[PDB]
């Protein structure tokens, strides 16, 4: 049983013929609500999907989760060669072509694909990420929801290079099994923007889950 998150070891990653470039269609993706869950920040969506790459069908977008740590240099779930990023976004997707809902897809072997976009604290103010950062005033208390009163295009939070690692693991809560698509190239944000998440209430200083052992029989693939 291979749990997530893991430390991806680059020397152990292997090739596969099906890892073409991943086509990401978020042109028709809009956000709906945004939540403080007591542990982390969730942003729900309606519309958008991913295709191409190694996927047989398309998987539609569900939600976005955001993770962070106590300090700026060390806050991601996943690691690459024992190196952590400042934070991590998890875009959840599910197989609508085969199955009738998200909670239905959570029970199947091939139900879920989670994309991982890393955050790195530089001195650039991310104009697209700010529109999420602004909404955090609504959801200060634990277990609160608010509507996303802001125009937002999800495409603009994609990294500049979409080379990727991919492995089978789980969801972060160990609810279900899921395929991961992890982009090593992080998007750049300011410390101000990330430190605003740390003012949320349960003070939520950090919410990353510690890594599990990469098993000897688990394969990690490079694109």
């Amino acid at each position, epitope marked *: 049983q*291979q749990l997530s998150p893991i430390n991806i070891e680059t020397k152990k990653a292997i090739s*596969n013929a099906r890892l073409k470039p991943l086509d990401i269609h978020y042109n028709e993706s809009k956000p709906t609500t945004i939540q403080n869950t007591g542990k982390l920040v969730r942003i729900n969506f309606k519309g958008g999907y991913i295709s191409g790459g*190694f996927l047989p069908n398309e998987y539609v977008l569900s939600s976005l989760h955001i993770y962070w740590g106590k300090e700026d240099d060390y806050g991601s779930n996943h690691l690459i060669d024992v190196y952590k990023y400042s934070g991590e976004i998890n875009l959840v997707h599910w197989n609508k072509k085969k199955y009738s809902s998200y909670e239905e897809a959570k029970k*199947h*072997d*091939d139900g879920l694909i989670i994309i991982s976009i890393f955050l790195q604290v530089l001195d650039h103010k991310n104009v697209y990420f700010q529109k999420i950062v602004n909404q955090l005033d609504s959801i200060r208390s634990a277990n609160t929801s608010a509507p996303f009163d802001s125009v937002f295009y999800l495409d603009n939070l994609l990294p500049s290079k979409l080379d990727y690692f991919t492995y*089978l693991g*789980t969801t972060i809560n160990h609810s279900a099994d899921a395929v991961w698509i992890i982009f090593p190239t992080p998007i750049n944000i300011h410390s101000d923007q990330l430190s605003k998440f740390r003012t949320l209430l349960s003070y939520i200083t950090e919410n990353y889950r510690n890594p599990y052992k990469l098993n000897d029989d*688990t394969e990690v693939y490079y694109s």
Partner: antibody
Framework: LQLQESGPGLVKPSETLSLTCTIS??????????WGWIRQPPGKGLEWIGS???????YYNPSLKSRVTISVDTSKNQFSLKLSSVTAADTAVYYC???????????????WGQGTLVTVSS | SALTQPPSVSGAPGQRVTISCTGS?????????VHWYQQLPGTAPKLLIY???NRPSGVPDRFSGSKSGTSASLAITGLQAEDEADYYC???????????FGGGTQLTVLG
């Protein structure tokens, strides 16, 4: 790790063939693998019947989809085949085997059982 | 959704024998890998090649795998008498949504 089929040699025609594979030396509840049944009629080729994930999900051969059922029992480290409405074409050696999950499809059949002969006859 | 193999091949001991596995755009040509198995009479299939080219521990160096386009090939370089067996290519097929075996090739060692 070992796989071990268990089940009757003989089943009467138009009735349900029933087999059970028992895994030992390792756990069946692992998300890296599927658990498959394969058959070989005497002097003929291998045919994949179907496969099952630890948590329940099934994938069957579309030739035999309507007659085939597979199930798992993670508490007893075993999985089962039931094949209904059986004719002389279903007389075969039946193999249980562990194969690899590769992302969103299947890889190789790494370990196989001995095989058990089931004969269709009145 | 079919993998074609020639029904029989033969060679003398120490010769190079190849066995082809012709597939389609729904299996080999879609990048799903090809795996090979050896079967001695009355025993279970045994994994010989996986991921087009890889050998498990125990399989000797003379066994070899390749793939290009819609076709894949098992080569045996230096036939031994113990290599008399049935050989099966195997892959995944997207329209089947599951595993797919070829018809098999009976290998006879002459001489």
């Amino acid at each position: 790790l070992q796989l071990q089929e268990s089940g009757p040699g003989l089943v009467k025609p138009s009735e349900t063939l029933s087999l059970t594979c028992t895994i030992s030396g390792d756990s069946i509840s692992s998300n890296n693998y599927y658990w498959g049944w394969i058959r070989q009629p005497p002097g003929k080729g291998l045919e994949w019947i179907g496969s099952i994930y630890y948590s329940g999900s099934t994938y069957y051969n579309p030739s035999l989809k309507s007659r085939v059922t597979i199930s798992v029992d993670t508490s007893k480290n075993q999985f089962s085949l039931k094949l209904s409405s059986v004719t002389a074409a279903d007389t075969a050696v039946y193999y249980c085997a562990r194969h690899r999950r590769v992302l969103l499809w299947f890889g190789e059949f790494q370990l196989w059982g001995q095989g058990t002969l089931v004969t269709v006859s009145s | 959704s079919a993998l074609t193999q020639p029904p029989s091949v033969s060679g003398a001991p120490g010769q190079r024998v190849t066995i082809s596995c012709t597939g389609s755009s729904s299996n080999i040509g879609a990048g799903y890998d090809v795996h090979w198995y050896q079967q001695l009479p009355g025993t279970a299939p045994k994994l010989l090649i996986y991921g087009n080219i890889n050998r498990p521990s125990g399989v000797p160096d003379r066994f070899s795998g390749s793939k290009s386009g819609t076709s894949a090939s098992l080569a045996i370089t230096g036939l031994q008498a113990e290599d008399e067996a049935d050989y099966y290519c195997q892959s995944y097929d997207s329209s089947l949504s599951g595993a797919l075996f070829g018809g098999g090739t009976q290998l006879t060692v002459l001489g």
